[PDB]
């Protein structure tokens, strides 16, 4: 299922083969809430640097085939799965949605905390 996270949690996940463990529990599909600091419209994919204050911005990729770029400094809700190359983790998102209501941002903090609590070991 989908685990609510912070980029600091993400950058600290260990790939024990091809699978990621967030500190101690496996995870793949995750959600984060952050601000777009930069947006780069590449050929077939849009790459964003999203920041949640917990670490340096993280690269969040969106494969967009043939008006799709969310403007910088906009708060967003990202949903995708964790990826990794030569040790540099990223995020492939199926969703990146501008937060309508900022209280959704405060709620995510609550969800992150009660998700790593109830799923902890």
């Amino acid at each position: 299922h989908i685990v609510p996270c912070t980029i600091s949690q993400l950058l600290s996940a260990t790939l024990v083969d091809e699978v990621f463990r967030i500190g101690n529990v496996e995870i793949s599909q995750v959600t984060i809430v952050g601000i777009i600091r930069h947006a780069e419209k590449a050929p077939t994919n849009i790459v964003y640097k999203i920041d949640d204050m917990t670490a340096a911005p993280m690269d969040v990729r969106q494969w967009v085939d043939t008006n799709t770029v969310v403007p910088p400094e906009t708060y967003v809700k990202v949903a995708g799965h964790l990826r990794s190359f030569q040790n540099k983790k990223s995020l492939v998102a199926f969703k990146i949605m501008p937060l309508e209501d900022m209280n959704e941002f405060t709620t995510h903090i609550l969800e992150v905390i009660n998700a790593h609590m109830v799923l902890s070991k």
């Binding site: 600290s12 900022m102 405060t106 903090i109």
Partner: protein
């Protein structure tokens, strides 16, 4: 622009315990200094923080403001950048945000700082 370091989310009462560290302060615009290079934000529990700017404002800020910066030796925040939260048919609840700030700090292991 310390955007590549972890910035801790805090409230007024934590200023003194975060001197010289990058922080993120969300509060409500209470007052703007006549010069436009400083302004005060009150946190979710009615307490004030002083925000110092390198360049003066160009627009009048109001509502909820999210400041990123470094706590100076006098317990004010030297702003690197700020954003003004938007508010739809639902106003931003600063009270609950203050609570998430107290939780963030109660559970550092479930909300790591970098």
């Amino acid at each position: 622009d310390m955007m590549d370091l972890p910035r801790s989310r805090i409230n007024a009462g934590m200023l003194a315990q975060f001197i010289d560290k990058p922080v993120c302060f969300v509060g409500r615009l209470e007052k703007i200094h006549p010069t436009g290079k400083m302004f005060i934000l009150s946190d979710g529990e009615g307490k004030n923080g002083t925000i110092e700017l390198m360049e003066p404002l160009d627009e009048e800020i109001s509502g909820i403001v999210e400041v990123v910066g470094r706590v100076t030796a006098k317990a004010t925040i030297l702003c690197t950048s700020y954003v003004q939260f938007k508010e739809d048919s639902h106003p931003f609840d600063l009270g609950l945000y203050n609570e998430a700030v107290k939780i963030i700090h109660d559970f550092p292991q479930f909300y790591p700082l970098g």
